[PDB]
Write a protein that binds this ligand. Structure first.
Ligand code: 7IK
Length: 528
């Protein structure tokens, strides 16, 4: 009923394990032995549930009894209970009950993964509904238009996934039923929610017309100039395409922004194989919102990565660390098209081509006599911070294919990464470095001889230690994606979480982790 110091230190280590680390039989025996002692530690609950044999009715019954008496786990920790590991309905309900306590802002941060988690729910319960996870998500969406917006588009992407339809038709049918349940709940509610239903329908019609227009532009066989002219001609013709002027609708990419149409004369096609469009949306308040609209292209890996980057940024900010990151919005409107929030910027490759150096760039657009190397101290501070943030973040996420056209710069000093087609250690070339810096970025802050290089290192340490403390949440979110139709995940689903977990070096104390991170940055820089 009570363990000794040696046992306590063992149980404490077990309780410290990452969420998807498998417990040995001995550890399962130990956690079970002292389950009553552990009811006062909310962090031990997930470990106890992992040691239960849910196929033995008497054991499951006792486990559920202890679940009711356990000090409730932190809301975030409940995401683990919605993974593929748990089929016991009372466990999965308990998770939903904890998630009910999260505010709308936090729930939005997990919503992408929770939609994936529907794959592990009871498909008959979802169908027969025409709180479990489906009921909960719909309930929250009917009370928050932003949640409704993302729930709708997340689920409609799943419904149009032809891979799921062929490979797992029952899961495809479930997602159809979720959409039916969602539509059912919206129509049933009050005027505010019924209005939401009409606005979602209006969004879908707008995207449909945009998709049709993109296809019409590409039926053309002319050069890029002729295609831009066609794109602008079809956009300016509101009567046929109805995209120049439409009733106010929430922008699916960022529904807080209401749009009235697309500005026809400024729409152009990117000079790239897939020829995505740059479009400027007319916002409700007379402004402009530029986006990239990709067609014939799967944005879902980018969508996940930008969502995780947004979360990591919010976590850092919550720890009072604003590293000036650029988590631009990404929203798939289907498996073959979607939106990206366009940030005015210049690729580092272009900076080098035209200015020769990042320092030359900053001196042209942010000069200051007595600033570091003649550059505005504010701009340099922003550069150092964002370099540090993306260094740690892209390291944890194993982002590959890091050429200088995928590193973008702003005249305010912000550096950020784009194009996340290679993640989790994948790379076009072999033997990719665990940490991927490049000479030009270090040179941008004045080289290793600058004070800025040490402040860069210090910010990496601080961000690394902060994100380490949220490893349970970050790993839990990735555990809910292991069965997702994401290329670099589906390529090795059973090793996906471990590949992120390893980056945290949770075997190392904070002090050792700082030394490790220092060694990593210096060694990466030494290689140049
Ligand atoms: C040719 C483009 C599609 C190119 C390549 N792939 C991408 O995913 C991507 C993201 C991106 N950024 C532009 C600046 O604003 C932020 C973000 C939208 N540029 N690109």
């Amino acid at each position: 009923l009570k363990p000794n110091a040696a046992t306590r230190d063992q149980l404490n280590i077990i309780v410290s394990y990452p969420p998807t680390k498998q417990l040995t039989y001995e550890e399962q025996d130990l956690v079970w032995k002292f389950r009553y002692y552990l009811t006062n530690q909310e962090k031990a609950l997930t470990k106890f549930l992992k040691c239960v044999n849910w196929d033995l009715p008497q054991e499951a019954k006792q486990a559920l009894e202890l679940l009711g008496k356990w000090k409730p786990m932190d809301v975030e920790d409940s995401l683990e209970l919605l993974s593929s590991h748990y089929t016991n309905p009372t466990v999965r309900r308990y998770a939903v009950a904890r998630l009910r306590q999260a505010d709308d802002e936090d729930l939005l941060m997990y919503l992408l993964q929770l939609v994936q988690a529907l794959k592990y729910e009871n498909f008959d319960d979802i169908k027969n509904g025409l709180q479990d996870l489906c009921t909960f998500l719909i309930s929250r969406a009917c009370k928050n238009s932003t949640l409704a917006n993302y729930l709708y588009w997340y689920v409609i992407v799943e419904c149009e996934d032809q891979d799921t339809q062929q490979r797992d038709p029952k899961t495809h049918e479930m997602y159809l039923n979720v959409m039916r349940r969602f539509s059912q709940a919206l129509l049933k509610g009050d005027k505010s929610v019924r209005v939401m239903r009409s606005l979602l329908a209006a969004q879908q019609t707008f995207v449909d017309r945009l998709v049709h227009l993109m296809k019409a532009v590409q039926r053309e066989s002319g050069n890029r100039k002729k295609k831009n002219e066609r794109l602008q001609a079809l956009l300016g013709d509101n009567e046929k395409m109805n995209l120049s002027d439409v009733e106010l609708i929430p922008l699916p990419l960022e529904p807080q922004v209401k749009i009235r149409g697309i500005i026809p004369e400024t729409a152009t096609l990117f000079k790239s194989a897939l020829m995505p469009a740059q479009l400027f949306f007319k916002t409700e308040d007379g402004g402009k919102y530029p986006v990239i609209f990709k067609h014939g292209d799967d944005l879902r890996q980018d969508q996940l990565i930008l969502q995780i980057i947004s979360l990591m940024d919010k976590l850092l900010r919550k720890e009072n660390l604003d590293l000036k990151l650029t988590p631009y919005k990404v929203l798939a409107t289907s498996t073959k098209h979607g939106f990206m929030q366009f940030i005015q910027s210049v690729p580092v490759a272009e900076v080098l081509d035209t200015e020769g150096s990042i320092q030359n760039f900053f001196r042209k657009y942010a000069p200051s006599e007595n600033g570091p190397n003649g550059i505005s101290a504010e701009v340099m501070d922003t550069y150092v911070k964002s370099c540090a943030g993306y260094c740690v973040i892209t390291y944890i996420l194993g982002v590959g294919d890091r050429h200088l056209d995928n590193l973008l710069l702003t005249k305010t000093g912000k550096l950020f990464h784009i194009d996340f087609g290679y993640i989790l250690g994948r790379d076009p070339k072999p033997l990719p470095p665990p940490m991927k810096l490049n000479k030009e970025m270090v040179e941008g802050m004045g080289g290793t001889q600058s004070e800025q290089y040490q402040e860069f290192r210090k910010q990496c340490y601080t961000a690394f230690l902060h994100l380490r403390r949220y490893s349970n949440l970050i790993l839990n979110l990735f555990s809910l994606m292991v069965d997702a139709n994401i290329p670099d995940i589906a390529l090795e689903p059973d090793k996906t979480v471990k590949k992120v977990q390893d980056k945290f070096r949770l075997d190392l104390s904070d002090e050792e982790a700082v030394h490790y991170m220092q060694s990593l940055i210096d060694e990466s820089v030494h290689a140049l």
